[PDB]
Design a protein around this ligand. Structure first.
Ligand SMILES: CCCCCCCCCCCC(=O)O
Ligand SMILES: [Ca+2]
Ligand SMILES: [Ca+2]
Ligand SMILES: [Ca+2]
Ligand SMILES: [Ca+2]
Ligand SMILES: [Ca+2]
Lengths: 57, 236, 296, 242, 57, 242, 49, 99, 49, 48
């Protein structure tokens, strides 16, 4: 039936792979879901301003 | 009601009384760029009438020995009229053309001129000069018309938007061509989407006495002109 | 509020007029019965190519034809059915002795205009979009199958190109590499349409520099960066000498083809690569010549 | 493992084999395909287009290679002059070498369908005339009389406003398809011959060229279809690409 | 599930191919639809006449 | 066994081939994946982040390598002074070498999208001014006049509370994607040039530094996307790892 | 290693062990080693008749 | 000075047009990047020498021995994943031996 | 790859083995089969004569 | 070549002997005063 041991286990992304063996880690990397979050690194500020507004009030 | 015709663009009008109809390059009219085919993020300039008008530039003399001539559209028009300016000020260019090669004579003259369009017209010779690749106004002349100076048979040129000016029937040809390139826009300062070739397949002949001055004029007009990437003025 | 001129102006039509629709055509047109016809005003035969159109006259209006059911399929005269055929486009030489490729490695420039056969066909159109499948036939100048190991590495334009038989570039941590023995069958590879341009360009009527275009720089006229796919590198996997004289031949087949503008066939003998230069001192007729237009 | 038993052909490499192959770039995406004018779908779309047929292919001066495209037609005097003759085979080394259609055939082994060939008079407008363009089906030797030529498929042509005129070569064969004819034996696939004669005479007023020219354009009909394929024999590279 | 990257993408013609990998371009050329348009090159004239009619009126 | 017929590529090893392989540890289970801050999903998430752009990359004293990050801006006197100039190409060996975005590009062959570059004034608070930051699209040679530079895409900037200011380089190209420009020919993919001029002058009161500095931060816009990939050419190891 | 190439009637026939005709850009060719099993080929009914 | 990447968009800067970005961002993903074979190890079992006589060799499991790969990976601080190793055995010349 | 285990007979060539083989002409179409008199189906049709 | 930059019209000879050129009222003022050289040329209609 297969095992659940492929690092990206319980991963939020949905990977559609191909595997011939019992262990899921032997499976290919396959197609994945495309999600992003430029903010966690670009705008990790507590308060948000917006372009139209002046950064420092 | 098929020989007579009139072309009106901008503030220019053309006439004819022996036309052989109009041909549309690959059956397609000059259209603007879709909001998905374009990558240039900036509303271009569609001056229209100011550039999309008829321009009568060069003229040549047909003779019982003439080999043939050719031009490079994108470049040819530059440096002239409002069009030239946008082409020199802007980086990206886009437009289709309406070509009208007129050449009349009397019913006692005989001759046949092949007027065709050839996309991405590259030439050989071991490398031709800038005065040969982009002879804008007044164009350039063919030395080996049989191979179109490119190594290709002219006998197979009809496989492109063409038309004939057989003095015994018509006295002018007219072609319409949409923008052609693997890209939405492209600077016409250094790249010519295509070229025009005019070669006498049937040697111009006529008994002595009849006015031997048989001129061939070239008149073109931009269509759906769009320019992007506004910057400093450039020439080449 | 509107100058009316702005309302009328069609300026902004991304939609092309067309005026010509593509229809199904599995079997060639089937001929139909036709009887005699004698009348004025009807001139099927009489045409005027001076317009630029291929005579639309049909057999029926010319002779009393019969009825025929054309079963002849036109599936083999399609793009894929034509171009999709393996052909020689590359050829590398890694000899033991010589000045060509010593050291044991070789960097081949990705260009197919080096061989007639293939170049003739492809240069029929102006533009072309597609994927391809390359096969690699490695062998010695005799046909000798040698137990040697090689490494084919693709080097995209802008990527570090190997400089020696043991250059760091062969670690290929990012680039795509393939290791094969000359004993194993040829390499099977699928390549997607990679290019900034929507379609490969066979003829580029312009300059890629945008500078002065001096005479010494006329070496650029015709060079289109959208056809520059970088280079292809190959070498023996070792620190010492190859021990064998090798010669790799690259074959290519096209899949999912999309051709556009069609141009005249080639009339003269090709001289340079990516250069339509021809034999100007001695030009030959497109075809065979006769003794008289009135004699066979 | 799973019981397998490789059959003949294993590890072989076929030039024209349609198969799969491992991808070199996982998750790659080709640049969007912009819309470009005049796209082609099938090659038979070209065979429809008429291209200049080099009937008068005798000259080879290299200075007179341009007259191979044209054609001479003077004001004869006798009754029944012969103006030109040529092979009816497209993929043959004959005059059909110039035509686009002809060059394409070199890439195919067999064909089928009728063929159209339009003739355009370039002479002065005052030039009048009438000519009989005949087509002698396979088996019929080159006619010697304008009277012996009209026994086959022909068509009289008059000069005037309608400069051009097209002659259709009806696919009249014993076989569904034809192989490119080439003299010895392989002439069993000859399409016949084409002759041109003066029905009347090249009448011209006082003050117009005493000699004019004609241009021949060839193409294939809709019922035209090619099969199989091969490398062209119409051209061969002498020197290796530099 | 596979990717959509095979040149003839969004192509009007319907190609029925075979693919074992994640990328669609690795797939064979396969069977395609037969469409034609001899007019775009043969009769790219603005106005149409017909055989029965005289080209130049 | 079962009839099989191995095709070309058999036994070959492709670096970038996504396939399966026998497991080394039957029934193995990786240590639970704890939750860890700042996880990354896509590389384009980094190209959004602005990194110091080394415009003033002339100094290489090794003692003055830190001033490559800063930028000089003194109190000129004339009208229309030029302050700096640099390439608009990210993956080029130019100043964009420092930027994170730049280093990433070295791993990709082509790109697409606009680019943002914020400039922050560090000078004294009393320091006032106004400057014209221009962007000359491809094809336009480096302007020589502040009047010839403003003909392209520019933006005037004033000094005050809002020290920073960002200039957006709109993706203005003829091709959907661009290949990393590198002089000869491959300049067909140049993104243009960027110039900086004094709109007015570096006005300063009596008692404040007569010379200040500016820092440039570069990043890519949301419409930015890279394609393909390769090994970086921005750095190469001279000696082997010990 | 060998190369079997089919040359249809009317196609350029190789004249030397290295004739240009062996590029087989259109013609169907097959490359095989004498170590690999024999070549397996399927041929359709090709004939005007 | 706050520590945020300017959120200014093209539109608010210049009179832009409309564009439909079809450009996919599937190749700029983690797997689509790292999932590429690369040299990380290299053992030498020569006949003559002082390096690896006796005929055996114990290599320490570490990939920081080669630039190419090491550069990419050291971009992040942490990394969880599975891997696929390929072993290319051959003589210092490229000679395929029946060993 | 997929776990396989070639059994005896691998790479062997049997004269009377009915199997498939790669096509030499993709999308080829044989000339229509005209109707011809006296066609044969089975050999026992001759043993009757 | 410098004349065709304005409002023009090409004319061919044949059955239709005649041909008409229309001078579009292109002025800065609603009405024009009869032009007469000095200053009062501010109402010139141009040239042909
Ligand atoms: C990875 C295979 C890509 C094949 C593209 C080949 C294009 C070569 C065209 C060369 C033309 C030129 O350089 O001007
Ligand atoms: Ca002139
Ligand atoms: Ca110029
Ligand atoms: Ca006379
Ligand atoms: Ca001070
Ligand atoms: Ca197997």
């Amino acid at each position: 039936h297969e095992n659940s041991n492929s690092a990206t286990e319980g991963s939020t992304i949905n990977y559609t792979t191909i595997n011939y063996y019992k262990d899921s880690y032997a499976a290919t990397a396959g197609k994945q879901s495309l999600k992003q979050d430029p903010d966690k690194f670009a705008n990790p500020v507590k308060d948000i301003f917006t372009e139209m507004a002046a950064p420092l009030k | 009601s098929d020989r007579v015709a009139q072309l009106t663009i901008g503030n220019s009008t053309i006439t004819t009384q022996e036309a052989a109809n109009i041909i549309v390059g690959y059956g397609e009219w000059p259209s603007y760029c879709s909001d998905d085919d374009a990558t240039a993020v900036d509303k271009p300039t569609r001056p229209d009438v100011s550039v999309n008008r008829f321009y009568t530039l060069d003229t040549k003399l047909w003779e019982k020995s003439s080999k043939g001539w050719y031009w490079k559209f994108p470049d040819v028009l530059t440096e002239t009229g409002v069009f030239g300016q946008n082409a020199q000020f802007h980086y990206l260019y886009r437009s289709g053309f309406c070509i009208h090669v007129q050449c009349n004579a009397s019913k006692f003259h005989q001759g046949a001129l092949l007027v065709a369009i050839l996309p991405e017209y590259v030439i050989g010779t071991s490398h031709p000069p800038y005065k040969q690749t982009q002879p804008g106004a007044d164009g350039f002349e063919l030395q080996h018309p049989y191979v179109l100076d490119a190594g290709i048979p002219i006998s197979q040129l009809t496989v492109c938007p063409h038309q004939w000016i057989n003095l015994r029937t018509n006295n002018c040809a007219t072609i319409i061509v949409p923008y052609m390139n693997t890209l939405p826009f492209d600077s016409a300062l250094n790249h010519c989407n295509f070229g025009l070739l005019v070669v006498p397949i049937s040697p111009l002949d006529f008994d002595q006495g009849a006015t031997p001055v048989i001129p061939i004029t070239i008149t073109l007009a931009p269509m759906c002109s769009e320019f992007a990437g506004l910057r400093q003025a450039v020439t080449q | 509020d509107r100058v009316a001129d702005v309302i009328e102006s069609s300026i902004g039509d991304s939609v092309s007029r067309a005026l010509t629709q593509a229809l199904p055509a599995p079997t060639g047109q089937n001929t139909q019965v036709s009887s005699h016809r004698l009348d004025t005003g009807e001139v099927p035969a009489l045409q005027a190519a001076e317009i630029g159109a291929s005579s639309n006259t049909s057999d029926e209006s010319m002779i009393e034809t019969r009825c025929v059911l054309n079963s002849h399929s036109t599936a083999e005269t399609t793009l894929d059915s034509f171009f999709s055929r393996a052909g020689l486009v590359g050829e590398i030489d890694l000899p033991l002795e010589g000045t060509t490729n010593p050291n044991g490695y070789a960097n081949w420039d990705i260009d197919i205009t080096g061989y007639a056969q293939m170049r003739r066909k492809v240069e029929l159109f102006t533009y072309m979009r597609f994927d391809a499948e390359f096969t690699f036939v490695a062998c010695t100048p005799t046909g000798q199958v040698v137990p040697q190991l090689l490494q084919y590495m693709f080097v995209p334009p802008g990527a570090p190109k190997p400089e020696s038989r043991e250059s760091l570039a062969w670690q290929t941590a990012t680039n795509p590499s393939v290791f094969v023995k000359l004993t194993d069958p040829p390499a099977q590879v699928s390549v997607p349409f990679m290019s900034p341009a929507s379609a490969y360009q066979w003829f580029y009527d312009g300059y890629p520099t945008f500078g002065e275009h001096k005479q010494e720089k006329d070496l650029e006229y015709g060079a289109c960066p959208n056809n520059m796919m970088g280079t292809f590198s190959v070498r023996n996997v070792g620190s010492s000498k190859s021990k064998y004289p090798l010669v790799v031949r690259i074959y290519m087949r096209m899949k999912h083809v999309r051709a556009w503008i069609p141009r005249p066939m080639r009339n003269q003998n090709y001289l340079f690569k990516a250069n339509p230069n021809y034999a100007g001192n001695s030009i030959k007729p497109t075809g065979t010549s006769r003794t008289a237009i009135t004699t066979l | 493992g799973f019981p397998t038993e490789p059959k003949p052909g294993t590890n072989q490499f076929l030039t024209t084999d349609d198969g799969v192959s491992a991808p070199i770039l996982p998750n790659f995406h080709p640049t969007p395909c912009i819309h470009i004018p005049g796209e082609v779908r099938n090659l038979l779309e070209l065979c429809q287009v008429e291209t200049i047929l080099e009937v008068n292919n005798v000259p080879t001066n290299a200075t007179s290679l341009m007259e191979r495209l044209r054609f001479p037609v003077s004001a004869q005097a006798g009754k029944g002059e012969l103006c030109a003759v040529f092979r009816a085979d497209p993929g043959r080394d004959g005059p059909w070498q110039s035509t686009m259609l002809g060059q394409l055939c070199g890439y195919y082994t067999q064909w089928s369908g009728s063929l159209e060939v339009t003739f355009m008079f370039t002479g002065s407008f005052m030039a009048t005339g009438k000519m009989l363009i005949a087509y002698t089906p396979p088996g019929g030797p080159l006619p010697k009389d304008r009277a012996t030529a009209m026994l086959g498929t022909h068509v009289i042509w008059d000069f005037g406003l309608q400069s051009s005129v097209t002659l259709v070569i009806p696919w009249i064969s014993n076989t569904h398809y034809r192989a490119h004819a080439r003299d010895g034996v392989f002439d069993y696939y000859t399409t016949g011959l084409v002759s041109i004669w003066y029905q009347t005479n090249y009448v011209v007023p006082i003050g117009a060229p005493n000699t004019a020219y004609i241009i021949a354009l060839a193409a294939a009909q809709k019922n035209f279809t090619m099969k199989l394929c091969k490398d062209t024999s119409h051209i061969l590279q002498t020197a290796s690409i530099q």
